Symmetry: D2
Subunit: 252 residues, 4 copies
């Protein structure tokens, strides 16, 4: 079927996009670097089974994809924003408006653009990649953390209205997901290379490793398959058992 | 001790301010209407125990209360927004922006202006009045529901950094809270007067009544008292045991 | 790879076993009825792809499957109990003991007998089929609701220790799951046939249908596949978007 | 009014009992050491405003208290059990039956015994002291942790049926609550005396300290007051912002 995967080059983008193509889907990909031609074209070259798009705004992209491939069956909102740690008084208020625009407004806008056709066909799936950060927050990341929570709750609240139209809505909240060359949010260096960082991941996850792009993609495809629509409204903590809580002195 | 209560004429404003006042706080009050002198002075007359301010903006308000009454010890971010039910496709994206601005950015901005003063003394109490909507969502309120979750998570998040400075941070998430003459969100009319409304409330809450402004105010005061700082980070569902969920055909209502 | 599915004739038993079988597992099956040879042999005839065992007790079962089929790679603790609605004062304390024994102790005991073998290889998958009741409770089901929460928390708790040995642990908490000819907990009769029941399900779930044994089975197989071990500790609400919560007088159903 | 506080000498017992008396309540106290006479009598001596009881089983104790003081207005189920850390295969199954009997069956049994009269008066409050452990579990405590979760969920599920009779039901889940001389669960030594243990509490709580008996008692009394009945069904995480999650290498 026809899927869209945003910000395809970062975070949960490559896992989701490439696993979806393997499921036989046509996969239109959005990204920021695709406002240029060298970039879109190189990507389209490197990935023949993927269709990059230059469209950059939300509703634009939905119409485009619908014109080119007939409709949008699956939306994977892979949202990203650079986390800046700051004590609350040291942020500007625009920094929180930043986070909210990128991590709540964007997914909202997308679904606002695509819902109508899904509802008329009474078919579609919607996946938000959010964050597990609200489940185990670090101090000094209040902008990023809270905006992620808003996104996850959006997914769950949509599941309630869109179930009537046979449309599942999911949020996937990762943490420690290996993002390979992407700085969002766990690049190979340092997160696999430096002992500092390997020792940390090992301590704070029960499985003692980063999540893989392959695991994220497997979930995304299993969900978008129509195999388990009854999980609608789930938020999935794709976090490897994070957090591992420090135990009492004396115990390993 | 100086409290600030926002949007004092609506939602949890009056219960908070009145009960904080009874506890002994000086209670500085913000409200949209107070940008007009008539309104401001009317309110001060009816409530000599409360201190209405005219300042509308966050930094501007915090500053004014600090100059006037020494400092800000307690912030009650009583945030409001007119919710509008739509299917998602029938909302404008601006309707979400609006909801986030009123329900997230505003408490953020108040904390952002006040936290440094609190952190220097190593004392203060911060309470967001959010909503219980994320806990039992209705269909077709996606914007307000998600934004409220966002503000509740913000309180929890902030509790982790502020703890270091002995500042507890809480979110109170009401539902079915009697709002008296305020339309945000459960006025006397129709919620106490119309039979369909009385019957609805009776079915959907476990206590079968609206929550009172007095209950909300007691909680706000209890949390601001220093009696139980070790709850910091808690989101409180002040919703009377809502939601009651429909049981199988045949079983009593 | 050898799976064990318990109480296979009921609740999520058949969907799990059938789909695990289709995925390629050898599926050893437990059921109360299999302590009788007639029952056991009937079942094996109808399902040549499944392997019914007669062993009833945890250590006894795990042992038998290990001797027969090499080892136990996947445990699906499909736990059941006849729920009885009572106001709390009308229950016996024994009614709670009963519920905890069937819904907590039993999965505990199965994991307790199987975990050492899994931990030596550093591979295995454990799935509890619990319930979504704690997520949207009904009044007057205190025993079953609480015990199910307990088993869901046990899965999460166990995930923290077993992670070290690359063993994911999950809880699937269904509601309104079509159970076919099993009375646990949503049989074809009345849940697909009686008009009041069809209408109830339509109102209270967001998908307006019962969940299918096939959906449950796909999840169980997906989780046992190794495709997404990094979900370990997850409690999954397999309930179709239940609960739908009654909106204000005047708004469509 | 008339309250009951179980296992008064440990965990949340002294805070709750003694704060309730200050609120003007008659407070009957249960404990294990009160199966003896030296113990009950010494306690009754040391605490004139408290009424210890020798009753040891649940329904017995409720009837007793009702005979002596007319009725039971407030029940504070302060449940305890010794946490044993064990990898799952190393427990016996009786060890989990142990935990469940002590931490779920007991509170259930109590409420089973007292509900009728509360429902007939259409007045009463019920408080379970559980644990915040399910909110942030340590590894190797699966018995204790899961049984606590069952208790907390019992409280919330009861809130649904007993609201109709004007009866709030709460659970208070502590962690790091200073229990003074009680080994359940954070005695003064080591938890205030040893630097090892002080440094740990400081790291894992946002407020960087143990909870006080006084804070627990303040909550218990505020709740049993009838001041904020609308919080019914709340589980309260009385944990000081625990857990504090380890941050990335390089950051404090
Ligand atoms: K997006
Ligand atoms: K007790
Ligand atoms: Na993240
Ligand atoms: Na709708
Ligand atoms: Na609300
Ligand atoms: Na169930
Ligand atoms: Na504990
Ligand atoms: Na009842």
């Amino acid at each position: 079927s026809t899927a869209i995967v945003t910000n395809v080059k970062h975070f949960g983008g490559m896992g989701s996009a490439l696993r979806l193509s393997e499921a036989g889907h046509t996969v239109a990909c959005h990204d920021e670097s695709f406002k240029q031609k060298d970039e879109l074209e190189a990507f389209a070259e490197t990935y023949p089974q993927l269709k990059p798009m230059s469209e950059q705004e939300p509703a634009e992209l939905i119409e485009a994809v619908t014109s080119a491939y007939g409709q949008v069956d699956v939306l994977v909102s892979n949202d990203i924003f650079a986390p800046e740690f700051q004590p609350i008084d040291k942020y500007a208020v625009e920094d929180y408006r930043g986070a909210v625009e990128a991590l709540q407004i964007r997914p909202f806008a997308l679904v606002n653009a695509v819902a109508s056709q899904m509802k008329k066909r009474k078919s579609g799936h919607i996946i938000f990649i959010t964050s597990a950060a609200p489940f185990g927050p670090w101090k000094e990341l209040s902008t990023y953390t809270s905006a992620r929570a808003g996104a996850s709750t959006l997914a769950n609240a949509l599941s309630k209205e869109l179930g009537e139209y046979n449309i599942p809505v999911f949020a996937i909240g990762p943490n420690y997901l290996h993002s390979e060359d992407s700085p969002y949010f766990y690049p190979t260096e340092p997160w696999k290379t430096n002992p500092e960082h390997v020792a940390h991941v090992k301590k704070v996850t029960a499985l003692q490793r980063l999540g893989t792009q392959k695991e994220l993609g497997e979930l995304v495809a299993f969900l978008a398959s129509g195999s388990c629509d009854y999980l609608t409204g789930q938020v999935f903590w794709l976090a490897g058992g994070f957090p591992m809580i420090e135990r009492f002195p004396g115990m390993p």
